[PDB]
Paper text:
Thymidylate synthase (TS, EC 2.1.1.45) is a ubiquitous enzyme that catalyzes the reductive methylation of 2′-deoxyuridine-5′-monophosphate (dUMP) to 2′-deoxythymidyne-5′-monophosphate (dTMP) using N5,N10-methylenetetrahydrofolate (mTHF) as a cofactor. In cells, TS provides the only synthetic source of dTMP necessary for DNA biosynthesis. TS works as an obligate homodimer, having residues from both enzyme subunits that contribute to substrate binding in each catalytic site. TS subunits are characterized by two domains, known as large and small domains (LD and SD, respectively).
The structure of EfTS in complex with the substrate dUMP was determined to be 1.75 Å resolution. While subunits A and C where dUMP is bound display the open conformation, subunits B and D where 5-FTHF is bound are in the closed conformation. The cofactor-analogue (6S)-5-formyl-6-tetrahydrofolate (5-FTHF) is entrapped in the active sites of subunits B and D by the same tight network of interactions already observed in the substrate-free form of the enzyme. Moreover, in these subunits, the catalytic Cys197 is modified as S,S-(2-hydroxylethyl)thiocysteine (CME197) by the reaction with β-mercaptoethanol (added to the protein buffer during the purification process). In the partner subunits (A and C), the electron density of the catalytic Cys197 suggests that it had been oxidized to sulfenic acid (S-oxycysteine, CSX197 in Figure 3). Despite the oxidation of Cys197, the substrate dUMP populates the active site, showing its uracil moiety positioned just above the cysteine sulphur (C6–Sγ distance of ~3.7 Å). The dUMP phosphate is salt-bridged to Arg22, Arg217, Arg177’, and Arg178’ (the last two from the partner subunit) and it is further H-bonded to the hydroxyl of Ser218. The most evident rearrangement concerns the flexible loop 18–26, which moves towards the catalytic cavity in the dUMP-bound subunits, exposing Arg22 inside the phosphate recognition pocket. The movement of Arg22, whose Cα shifts by ~5.8 Å, is fundamental to create the four-arginine cluster that anchors the dUMP phosphate in the substrate site. Remarkably, despite the full occupancy of the substrate site by dUMP and the movement of the 18–26 loop towards dUMP, the SD retains the open conformation, in which it is widely unstructured. This observation strongly suggests that in EfTS, the open/closed transition occurs as a biphasic process in which the dUMP accommodation triggers the closure of the loop 18–26, whereas the binding of the cofactor (or analogue) induces the movement and the organization of the whole SD.
Numbering used by the authors:
A (entry chain B): 1 to 315
B (entry chain A): 1 to 91, 125 to 130, 134 to 314
The structure:
Amino acid sequence: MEEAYLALGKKILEEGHFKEDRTGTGTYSLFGYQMRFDLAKGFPLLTTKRVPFGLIKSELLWFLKGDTNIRYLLERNNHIWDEWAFERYVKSADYQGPDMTDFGHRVLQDPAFAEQYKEEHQKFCDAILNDAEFAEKYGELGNIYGAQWRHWETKDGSFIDQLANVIEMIKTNPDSRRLIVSAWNPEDVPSMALPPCHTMFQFYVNEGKLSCQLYQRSADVFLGVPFNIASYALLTHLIAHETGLEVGEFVHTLGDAHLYQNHVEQMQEQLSREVRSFPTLVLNPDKASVFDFDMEDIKVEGYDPHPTIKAPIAV
Amino acid sequence: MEEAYLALGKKILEEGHFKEDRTGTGTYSLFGYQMRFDLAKGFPLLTTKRVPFGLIKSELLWFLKGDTNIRYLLERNNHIWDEWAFERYVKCDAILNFAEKYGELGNIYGAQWRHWETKDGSFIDQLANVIEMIKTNPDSRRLIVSAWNPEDVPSMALPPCHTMFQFYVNEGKLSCQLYQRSADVFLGVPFNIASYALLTHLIAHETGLEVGEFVHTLGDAHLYQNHVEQMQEQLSREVRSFPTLVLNPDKASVFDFDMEDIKVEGYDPHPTIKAPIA
Ligand SMILES: Nc1nc2c(c(=O)[nH]1)N(C=O)[C@@H](CNc1ccc(C(=O)N[C@@H](CCC(=O)O)C(=O)O)cc1)CN2
Ligand SMILES: O=c1ccn([C@H]2C[C@H](O)[C@@H](COP(=O)(O)O)O2)c(=O)[nH]1
């Protein structure tokens, strides 16, 4: 239920202590929490603010195809992963523009700086889309989600298709208590742009229904959790479709649950608004595998949220 | 609190749906559960039945030291591996007094925690690294130890039940959350609570911190159908205060702790309740 996500934000505002963080922004933080969404009551795309479903769709199809380079995302006008690739490029020996140290805070404080950032980010997006060599080197985020889900590398010259394996297991061993996918690969963590926020997840079958639990080590509550929720709920529906099952519950478990301190006014404005009905998900019935779905095969119908509430991403 | 454990038992007896399992025994199960233990309130070794802290501590020190050979356990009267290692051989004093040959137990917690193999043939020490990160960078959201390698899982007889755990530091207190994919709620969960609360206290000791909370997250939480009468007996008994953990103050590093260095004071449980392993 949406009220479950809104009660987490209110608990952080009330009693989550201040914790300095890697980004330099500052957060209010709790440790250890659990929410549940019954997917039979509606698709959990939040209605108390507008959440863009097409960016959640394109990000998950990107994961599912095993891709860890942002060119696919830019082709679909999805810029949610741009920051970390831009930071990689401004730190390299090839960047020749104005200094971009600490650009993620500087843009909020200094209009002259903000215009130079906007200029350099444009030139970056154009180069990824138009120069294949530039994209191959500077679009690359390392072995994040797509690579661990489809291509966990072995010590003997091969790779494990972890996500296709677990879908198969659901079909022939549905009571198995080892239906797990992990993106936590210790050997690859240091070279990933960021280590996986949404860390490992497990499926469960009973009485013809599929359920999924996620363990999320680090949750940005205002900007990232509404995307996370909707992404794992879509993944659970696609798998249920291929395996011929009905949908059960998504259980979301958090580690460090944090509100960044420059999202507090946004959270308070969200908390003032009346919840509406969740929308319904519609999937193309003639697609058989999760891997065959494309953008036009997936939609939400009946979505009528309250207005967008903008907030800055912590880099 | 102990009541939060007993509440999980009672919920599965009332609402757990019937669900078949690997062993062919019946179970009543729920998916997704979370319990909190505030370690300032007492050390969570259950009072409503006796739980053997001796086997928990020899097993936990064995893993911490990255040891994987049973000699260590046998010396400390923990037999939870005896038959298997003999069965390996058939294909016990000599282990104590041949041990290097017939006494090794491969791909288990100690090795994944302190010797995770990489593609080039070197090894990551996850637990040493996380201790050093607690000391230098306590606000880190990446304080993670994983036991789950998909390259290894398909060939082992029991893939890890304790798939990964995470630490957290605030106001000078250390907390730990465990993700446990599969929980036998009568027999395994009481042992599991104590193990991971003890690990939270040993790490807080090594890092100069006080204790916060142990948060226990469950995937498939199940009562075996032949443990129902035992759970019902336990639920009829009055809860008592948890005992107090005492660690040896005169030893800096826990990597030099042994059995005599870890004690529980004030433990006053109701009697042992017997049941079968599935
Ligand atoms: N700080 C932070 N970094 C992170 C995450 C996170 O949740 N928080 N992620 C966690 O998985 C990944 C990125 N996910 C993101 C999700 C949403 C938006 C975002 O800015 N949403 C805005 C604007 C959307 C739009 O472009 O229209 C919004 O929802 O209003 C950014 C990154 C990697 N890095
Ligand atoms: O420390 C332990 C070890 C084992 N189990 C139980 C959980 C399951 O009943 C069984 C393992 O069976 P699978 O989940 O792998 O089927 O052992 C625990 O609860 N805790």
